[PDB]
Structure 1
């Protein structure tokens, strides 16, 4: 295996925690990459500091990390970003775009990400569903603009498994495109594939039943984006 993938659900079991760390040792010995897909279960949303202490070791043992916007903001500070979203200028906007009252797609600075960064981390991806994919590398950072339409099929849409499809697409492009870790344009172009994979996965009832194929995902990616973004 070239990528080792696990979730934070194993951290809720001590046996699985010890087995996970032994398996991570074995995988790092043979040259594999460690993919931490947080997916915080219900117990791990109790408090920030407890979850940080629980996940710090596995967090530091990971080369690739995927968290949702809610998970990242819970791990850093929930109330600060909640207040920041609710802020409205009192007299006039600071630019024309602030007048449109659009949905907030705030891109966290690497200075804000600094507490969660470590030396072996090659790629951090923050996902606002399929709408935004904030990526952070030791060299650069940015956001991939995506979309969603579950209203196109109101009676078959189901969001279960969409994040699994996004993570699977990320791994699929990482295993075959090593330049993603070092080239920003290539990274965004390959992350649009995972965006498309997540979009398709929301159109079917059932996670496993609705997982897209590579052909359908590439077709949707080429249909949604303009040809220069492929």
Structure 2
């Protein structure tokens, strides 16, 4: 088996398509998209470091010096061929991609209904990205891959749910690690309990989990942490640093994380964009302090694909540094690499277009941090 160790990204291959969508209270002009860049340097909190499809993570991982394979299905039309060509030019392994000649890539058949006086839609025919069967899996890829990566978008499709669980069994049989990068799509933000029930099985099937701060707080309690953020003492601060009215970087205790912990979880990472990387392991926990600067390039900055770069950097360091799971100092040092990768990825328009290379990421990491933190 060649080096570096292979990773597998399972799910849909799409161009852009950030899944995490919520309501923002600061909209720009509905027509003048030249104003919408001001929401890139003053983003909604859930969109600070947005993730995307697993193909973004695969491309970013390959650009950071790793070897990746994509497992999914595309149609036999022009769009599927173009997506496969884009993944191939990025040196992502395509042997796990299954073609469907009778399906239209990234197209879903829906029926519009008017239940209870409101327009609604229901899926008639699923797209080929959500129509991968367990018999179409690539067993060589699942055998070679050391990390298995997927998003919660597949949980919105029953076919992909069954295929994902079969693939997880296959990967665990061969010794691979399961990376659950949540990336909650629009439907999965409706209420906490239904999402917890929907993601419980995949959550317990994962060794590595990455969630955003908003995702974790939604999964535990949104109102409690919103109230805790808004609290201000009436008379005097409890310490001087609380007098500065600095941005809140609250580090969740493992006791608060206890509902979401299970036995096979080796590492949980909570990302507040690139600013904070809260990590939790069975033995220890902590936070990696990062930064961001999209105002350095106000006319080319774009946060799309930043979380993909962070996750790809995490996987790149995990595949080559097994001591990350057991050493806290090594874990922080290697997570600074993912912080730098996420920082660079915010400087370009387009997720795939702006994915950094390993050389640039290491250069930025050494420039930003003091030499003792390398």
TM surpasses 0.5:
yes
Give 4+ residue runs of structure 1 displaced > 2 Å after superposition: none
* Residues 83-117 of structure 1, C-alpha deviations (whole Å, 9 max, x = no match): 00000000000000000000000000000000000
**Matches of 2:253 and 2:232, distance apart in 1:** 21
- Give the TM-score of the pair, scaled to structure 2: 0.61
Select the structure of larger CA radius of gyration: 2
Counterpart of 2:276 (choices 132, 141, 144) is: 132
Partner SS, residue 9 of structure 1: helix
How far 1:38 sits from its partner (Å)? 0.0
Deviation at 1:79, TM superposition (A): 0.0
Q: Deviations over 1:3-23 (max 9, x none)?
A: 000000000000000000000
State the shift of 1:72 in Å.
0.0
Gaps of 5+ in 2: 1-144
In structure 2, C-alpha distance between the alignment counterparts of 1:97 and 1:155, rounded to whole Å: 35
For 1:190 and 1:80, how far apart are their aligned partners in 2? 32
Q: Which has the higher helix share?
A: 1
- Higher relative contact order, chain-length normalized (CA < 8 Å, sep 6+): 2
Give the secondary-structure state (helix, strand or coil) at the position aligned to 2:178: strand
For the aligned residue pairs, the C-alpha RMSD in angstroms reads: 0.1
1:50-93 deviation line (CA, Å, top 9, x unaligned): 00000000000000000000000000000000000000000000
- After TM superposition, the structure 1 = structure 2 runs for residues 62-211 of structure 1, keeping only pairs within 5 Å, are 62-211=206-355
- SS of the aligned residue for 1:51 comes to helix
Q: Give the CA deviation at 1:156.
A: 0.0
Cα shift at 1:171: 0.1
How many residues are aligned here?
Answer: 230
d(CA) in 2 for partners of 1:90, 1:143: 29
Distance 2:343 2:233 in 1: 34
What runs of 5+ residues in structure 1 fail to find an aligned partner?
none
